[PDB]
């Protein structure tokens, strides 16, 4: 869309309707007259538009009312109420703007934020900008969390996030105007190369892929139309559902052949019956002729009974001859309606072994996309977030994604090398206990009003617990941590003295040998200004590779690469790095996914803040003290940088409301 409505859509909001969370705060308006609703909407859209048109400076209430129009710019409490709501939930003035009113003299409330992964950072900036006292505690010695970027000389490569998923209402859209990231598009062109080391024909490539997409939708039909969602008590995975469909395909392939040859026999067996009839006719025709010959040797003149005999046997014969001509007639028809059948047999196979194997790469890709074995993705929900996807084409950060957290981090109080070990939260406050990662006996205590927890799901899953909650997290929240899926995927970074791949290609795939190893180095990325290649280890393979030395790994790499590019167009790599995210203590994996038997509704559970019991019993019910953000908390944008960033905005909005009071709901 475009104009004011451009902004509404570009901000993830319906241009012509009020959201649930708008109703929440403007219950007067939404329950009120259609007329007023439409003013509101415009006001909202317009303000957005202004912020959007220019997000390198703050957008004040004044500056808004300024550019507004009568009738709209008549009611200035509406304008204030709207510009405030917007400001508060980070729809406007989020990220990195230039202030206009430098930051109000003294602060208010104190919040401890665990972990300076993007979610963390974005929430911290928000809060600080809302005049609060904010400290973030980070276990690592750098910001960014799962946004690692490797740097050395002019080598630059993310082992972290890597792709921006296209600017169609992506908040990163703004971030990227505010920060100098160089965004290069991802040329969708991706050649495949079998174990042998030779391209896969344009012929095949397409047959397989297209079968792949066909297979996917197939599962969707199974799921929704046939209701194949439980199976002897376990939830059905996508993997299961795929195999079941493939089987059913092979079953049909045979099914057909069977009833095709079954047609041959039923025909070849009419030919059999006819021939018998035909032989036994030549049998009478033989012996009958004889008798006519015999009856002709009685020489005339003959009496009438003997004359009759001749004439009679003569007819009887030309009669029997009639039939046999008509039967060799029929015979001919059948004999051809029989190469008819031998000319077009149904297909030999469903998929060949070179097929099943390429198809297997298309699965690896899906495993790479969801960081998991398809045997673990929920069939019913694995793709629930599919609707909310941005428009436009995926990109990469040419100068390293890390430039973004670094950017956000600027201005903030961040304790690096500070591993939170215990969160205790009570009616009157919280205290957080961290240690120093370098000498771990050396101890820290932080007192605050609220804790925003941006710990990775992996971490929150750990047994036994790496962070301990006091009191324990309510069971409803812990079940949700169990049920959800935290996946895994790893990168390998290859650094050379010269380009030797197709420079106009961004990504080529390698086709593995077995189902079991579809993920092993299945795809490579030429992304960068230096000669760097980047290779993925996804699916089942990912977890296994983390148990194998870097050399061995880089081995299998060069191997695969020589195989494609010629056994000595491929030099030794100057510099190599190899992630192990399931290993890494401050992540324990890569990003969440919708495990079988979970739903989207679990992501919502993750976000629900915690409210301590009362202190002195029968005192009034407290404020909520413990809140959560981060990638695993945002139902509609899981497992992504923008998704995190946005969870951060979310919680910061929510906390500010709670502690600084919502002035704008009146």
């Amino acid at each position: 869309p475009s104009g004011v409505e451009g902004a509404a859509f570009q901000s993830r909001l319906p241009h012509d309707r009020m959201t649930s969370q708008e109703a929440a705060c403007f219950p007067d308006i939404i329950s009120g007259p259609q007329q007023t609703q439409k003013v509101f909407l415009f006001i909202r859209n317009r303000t957005l538009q202004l912020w959007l048109d220019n997000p390198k400076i703050q957008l004040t209430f004044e500056a808004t009312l300024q550019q507004l129009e009568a009738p709209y710019n008549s009611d200035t409490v509406l304008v204030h109420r709207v510009h405030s709501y917007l400001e508060r939930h980070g729809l406007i003035n989020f990220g990195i703007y230039k202030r206009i009113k430098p930051l109000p003299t003294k602060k208010t409330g104190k919040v401890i934020i665990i972990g300076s992964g993007v979610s963390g950072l974005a929430a911290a900036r928000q809060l600080q900008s809302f005049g609060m006292d904010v400290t973030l505690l980070e276990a690592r010695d750098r910001v960014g969390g799962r946004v690692a970027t490797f740097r050395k000389g002019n080598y630059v490569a993310d082992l972290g996030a890597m792709v921006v998923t296209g600017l169609g209402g992506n908040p990163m859209a703004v971030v990227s105007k505010q920060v100098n990231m160089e965004l290069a598009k991802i040329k969708q062109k991706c050649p495949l190369y079998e174990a042998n080391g030779q391209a896969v024909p344009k012929e095949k490539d397409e047959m397989v892929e297209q079968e792949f997409n066909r297979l996917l939708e197939a599962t969707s039909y199974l799921s929704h139309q046939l209701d194949f969602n439980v199976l002897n008590n376990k939830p059905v995975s996508l993997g299961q559902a795929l195999e079941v469909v493939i089987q059913l395909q092979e079953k049909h392939v045979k099914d057909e052949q069977i009833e095709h040859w079954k047609k041959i026999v039923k025909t070849q067996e009419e030919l059999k019956e006819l021939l018998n009839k035909m032989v036994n006719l030549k049998e009478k025709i033989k012996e009958l002729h004889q008798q006519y010959k015999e009856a002709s040797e009685v020489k005339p003149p003959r009496d009438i009974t003997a004359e009759f005999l001749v004439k009679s046997k003569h007819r009887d014969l030309t009669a029997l001859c009639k039939e046999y001509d008509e039967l060799a007639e029929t015979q001919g028809k059948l004999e051809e309606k029989l190469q008819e059948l031998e000319a077009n047999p149904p297909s030999d196979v469903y998929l060949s072994s070179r097929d099943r194997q390429i198809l297997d790469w298309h699965f690896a890709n899906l495993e790479f996309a969801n960081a998991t074995p398809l045997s673990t993705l929920s069939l019913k929900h694995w793709d629930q977030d599919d609707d909310f996807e941005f428009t436009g084409s995926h990109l990469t950060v040419r100068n390293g994604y890390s430039c973004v957290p670094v950017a956000l981090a600027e201005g903030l109080d961040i304790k690096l090398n500070t591993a939170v070990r215990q969160v205790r939260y009570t009616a009157s406050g919280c205290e957080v206990i961290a240690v120093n990662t370098r000498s771990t006996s050396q101890t820290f205590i932080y007192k605050c009003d609220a804790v925003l927890c941006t710990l990775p799901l992996g971490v929150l899953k750990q047994q036994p617990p790496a962070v301990q909650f006091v009191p324990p997290l309510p069971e409803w929240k812990t079940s949700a941590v169990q049920r959800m899926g935290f996946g895994n995927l790893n990168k390998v970074v290859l650094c050379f003295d010269r380009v030797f791949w197709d420079p106009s290609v961004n990504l080529f795939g390698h086709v593995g040998s077995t189902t079991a190893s579809r993920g092993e180095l299945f795809l490579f990325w030429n992304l960068y200004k230096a000669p760097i290649l980047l290779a993925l280890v996804a699916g089942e393979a990912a977890g296994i590779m983390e148990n194998i030395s870097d050399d061995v790994i880089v081995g299998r790499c060069l191997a695969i690469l020589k195989g494609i590019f010629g056994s000595s167009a491929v030099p030794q790599p100057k510099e190599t790095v190899v992630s192990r995210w399931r290993a890494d203590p401050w992540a324990r994996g890569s990003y969440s996914y919708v495990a079988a038997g979970s739903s989207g509704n679990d992501y919502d559970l993750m976000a629900q803040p915690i409210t301590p019991g009362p202190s002195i019993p029968g005192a009034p019910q407290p404020i909520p003290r413990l809140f959560f953000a981060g990638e695993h908390t945002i139902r509609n944008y899981p497992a992504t940088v923008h998704g995190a960033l946005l969870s951060g905005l979310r919680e910061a909005g929510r906390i500010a409301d709670q502690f600084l009071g919502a002035m704008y709901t009146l």
């Binding site: 066909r214 297979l215 939708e217 197939a218 039909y221 199974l222 139309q225 046939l226 194949f228 199976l231 195999e243 079941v244 469909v245 089987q247 059913l248 395909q249 092979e250 079953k251 049909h252 045979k254 099914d255 052949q257 069977i258 040859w261 079954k262 041959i264 026999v265 070849q268 067996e269 030919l271 059999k272 021939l275 018998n276 035909m278 032989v279 030549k282 025709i285 033989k286 002729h289 006519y292 009438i304 009974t305 004359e307 009759f308 004439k311 009679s312 003569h314 007819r315 014969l317 030309t318 009669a319 001859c321 046999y324 060799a328």
Partner: protein, 133 residues
């Protein structure tokens, strides 16, 4: 609405490949056998058929009797009458064969005949004796 066309997925078929641990490769194998068990029986009957084709080798060519090109008539030579009476005894109501035997009489002059000489050829008797066989 329906499976993306090409894919086959009956309700009934699904419950069948799920039933147990390897109903999967079971049912896929019944057909694997079931198939060769037909392909084989094609051979048998392709062979049985092939021998019968060799018997028929020769056609019926040495046995076919030249064209009786002769022309229809009206008179009833006493010969023609006797031929008739005997054709009746051997053919019943097959007016067609009876005409064929007397060569030069129409399938109708025949039916006619049946009613003129019916009288003095006891064609009643004649016919009831063809029936008795």
């Amino acid at each position: 609405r329906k499976p993306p066309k090409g894919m086959f997925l009956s309700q009934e078929d699904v419950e069948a490949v799920s039933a147990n641990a390897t109903a999967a490769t079971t049912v896929l194998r019944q057909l694997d056998m079931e198939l060769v068990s037909v392909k084989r029986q094609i051979q048998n009957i392709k062979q049985t058929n092939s021998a019968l084709k060799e018997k028929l080798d020769g056609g019926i060519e040495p046995y076919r009797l030249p064209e009786v090109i002769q022309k229809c008539n009206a008179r009833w030579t006493t010969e023609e009458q006797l031929l008739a009476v005997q054709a009746i005894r051997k053919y019943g109501r097959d007016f067609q064969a009876i005409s064929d035997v007397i060569g030069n009489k129409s399938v109708v002059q025949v039916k006619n005949f049946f009613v003129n000489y019916r009288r003095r050829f006891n064609i009643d008797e004649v016919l009831q004796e063809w029936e008795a066989e």
